[PDB]
Structures are given as C-alpha cells and as structure tokens.
C-alpha cells in the first residue's frame, strides 16, 4: 500500500521492473537449446532452465518446454509452460497425467491481435472428443461453464492403454485485454478464487498448470498474487511479505516471470485488493 503509492507517485514501475530484470538469476537451458528439440518450442517464448525442468517419462526425448516453480514456505507449486504447439498437444497432455495436475490455468485467448497464440488443445464439443496418437491419450470435454470473464471446463483426461481415467478442470480466461493489462485485478482475483475453490491449487494433487501466449508474461502475475496472499494468511507479519522477493524467488524456477513494468504494477493492485477481500 505504502510502497504502491511511493511507486506510482515517483513514476517508478519501469526502474524497479529494470531492477528485477538485472537481478533475475540466470541459469542453463541446454536440453532446451538442444537441435532434435528446436521444433519444440514456440517462438517468442523463454526456455525452461535445466533444473526445474519437468521431464516427459519417455524414453526417446523427455523434452517439453514447462518448468516447476516450488514455493516452500508457502507450500505451493506450479508448473508453467508455453501454450501448447499443434505438434506438443500430446505432450502437453502427457504431463499433465504423469504430473497428477487436477487444473490447467490459461490466460490466453487462442487467437489474439489476430494471430494464433496456442494450439486448440482441448475438444470443443461433447461428441467429438480429441486423441492424442503420439502419447496414447484421449481427451473429452464433459462439461463448460462460460461466464462475462472468464469460462471453466470440465475435462476427461484417458490413458488408452490401460483405459483410466481422471477428471481435469481447465480455467480459462478469456478476458486479459490484447494491450496492457486489466483495468481492475477485480476478475483475475474472482478468477484465482475459483481456480483455489476447486482444490486444483492444493497439495492432494500434482501441480497446477499454468500457460499464456509466448514472451508476454499473465502466467507469473497469477503464481505470484497467488503465493503473495497465501503468505499473508501464514504469516505473523503479513507486511514483512515483499513481493519483490517473492517474484525474484519464483524467477529462480522459470524466467520471464512478469514481462513489463505493467505487470508489476497490476500483480500489486491484485495482492493488495486481495488481501482486504480475505
Ligand atoms: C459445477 C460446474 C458445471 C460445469 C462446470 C465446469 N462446473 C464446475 C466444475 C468444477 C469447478 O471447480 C467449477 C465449476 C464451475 O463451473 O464453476
Ligand atoms: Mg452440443
């Protein structure tokens, strides 16, 4: 509250933003970097340093570009990766079952400033279900949910070889504007709630799974307002929670974690206005 307001009458966003960007960690991504997985990746996006790499259980190449952010203290982790490619849908079901993720977060829209941002990974209607010849998947949408913000689905993820079956809820928002950021954090803070409501955030499940569109940040915004209010619950000072270390600590697992000084700004206002709502 404090610190916002010293920030926005200062005009400081950008210099704090440029500082985090200095002091973010570097770290390898050689498997990344790797020839057989140039078509792998999606332009424009970062690369998932090695250490927090999550590995497909395959064989051949375990390569998928999604990283595990692990907040200890807070006892919260998240897989983030890039939207899916038309030839990494498999792959990106494929983890979400080895995983054990109850909940795929995206904060994109499929098509924005008239560009496709990330394949259609997921059936669109009931009666025609997608298969996945690759990874020996099946995917079925059972039931949506489209509200003015943003639309829940329910899932139905199938292991065709040995036919189990688990339920996967995909929380979609529709709504982030094609510039900038939203005016109010009022519907990503409804959208996070829904998303925490419905356990898809909770330690009895593998990790959430988090994308957007590539080298734009969103994904980092919504991991990070998420864990800032988590710790201010925990916490015997909710006021010693700095968001800047937080973001700096999340950074260490996956880079690009908030992508503009906009972003910043916008992660603040949702942490602060969520905190008085909870
Ligand atoms: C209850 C329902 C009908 C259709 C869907 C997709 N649902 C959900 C299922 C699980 C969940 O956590 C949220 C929702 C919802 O739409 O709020
Ligand atoms: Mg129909």
């Given at each position: 509250?404090?610190?916002?307001?010293?920030?926005?009458?200062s005009?400081?966003w950008?210099?704090?933003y440029?500082?985090?960007?200095?002091?973010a960690?570097?770290?390898p991504?050689?498997?990344?970097?790797?020839?057989?997985?140039?078509?792998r990746?999606?332009?424009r996006?970062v690369?998932?340093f090695?250490?927090?790499?999550?590995?497909?259980?395959q064989?051949?190449?375990?390569?998928?570009?999604?990283?595990?952010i692990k907040?200890?203290?807070?006892?919260?982790?998240?897989?983030?990766?890039?939207?899916?490619?038309?030839?990494?849908?498999?792959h990106?079901?494929?983890?979400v079952?080895?995983?054990?993720?109850?909940g795929?977060?995206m904060?994109?829209?499929?098509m924005?400033?008239?560009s496709?941002?990330?394949?259609?990974?997921?059936?669109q209607?009931?009666?025609?279900?997608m298969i996945?010849?690759?990874?020996?998947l099946k995917?079925?949408?059972?039931?949506?949910?489209?509200?003015?913000?943003?639309?829940?689905?329910?899932?139905?993820?199938e292991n065709?070889?040995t036919?189990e079956?688990?339920?996967i809820?995909?929380?979609?928002?529709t709504?982030?504007?094609?510039?900038?950021?939203?005016?109010?954090?009022?519907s990503?803070?409804?959208?996070?709630?829904?998303?925490?409501?419905?356990?898809?955030?909770?330690?009895?499940?593998?990790?959430?799974?988090?994308?957007?569109s590539?080298?734009?940040?969103?994904?980092?915004?919504?991991c990070?307002?998420?864990?800032c209010?988590?710790?201010?619950?925990?916490?015997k000072?909710?006021?010693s929670?700095?968001?800047?270390?937080?973001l700096?600590?999340?950074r260490?697992?996956?880079?690009?974690?908030?992508?503009?000084?906009?972003?910043?700004?916008?992660?603040?206002?949702?942490?602060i206005?969520?905190?008085?709502?909870i």
């Amino acid at each position: 509250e404090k610190e916002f307001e010293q920030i926005d009458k200062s005009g400081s966003w950008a210099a704090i933003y440029q500082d985090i960007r200095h002091e973010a960690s570097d770290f390898p991504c050689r498997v990344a970097k790797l020839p057989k997985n140039k078509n792998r990746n999606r332009y424009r996006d970062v690369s998932p340093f090695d250490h927090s790499r999550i590995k497909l259980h395959q064989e051949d190449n375990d390569y998928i570009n999604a990283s595990l952010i692990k907040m200890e203290e807070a006892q919260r982790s998240y897989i983030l990766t890039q939207g899916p490619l038309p030839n990494t849908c498999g792959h990106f079901w494929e983890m979400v079952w080895e995983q054990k993720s109850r909940g795929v977060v995206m904060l994109n829209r499929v098509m924005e400033k008239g560009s496709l941002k990330c394949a259609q990974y997921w059936p669109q209607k009931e009666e025609k279900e997608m298969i996945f010849e690759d990874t020996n998947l099946k995917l079925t949408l059972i039931s949506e949910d489209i509200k003015s913000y943003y639309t829940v689905r329910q899932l139905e993820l199938e292991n065709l070889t040995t036919q189990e079956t688990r339920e996967i809820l995909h929380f979609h928002y529709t709504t982030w504007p094609d510039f900038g950021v939203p005016e109010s954090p009022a519907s990503f803070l409804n959208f996070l709630f829904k998303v925490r409501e419905s356990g898809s955030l909770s330690p009895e499940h593998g990790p959430v799974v988090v994308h957007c569109s590539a080298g734009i940040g969103r994904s980092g915004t919504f991991c990070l307002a998420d864990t800032c209010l988590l710790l201010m619950d925990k916490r015997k000072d909710p006021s010693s929670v700095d968001i800047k270390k937080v973001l700096l600590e999340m950074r260490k697992f996956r880079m690009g974690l908030i992508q503009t000084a906009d972003q910043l700004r916008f992660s603040y206002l949702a942490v602060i206005e969520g905190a008085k709502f909870i």
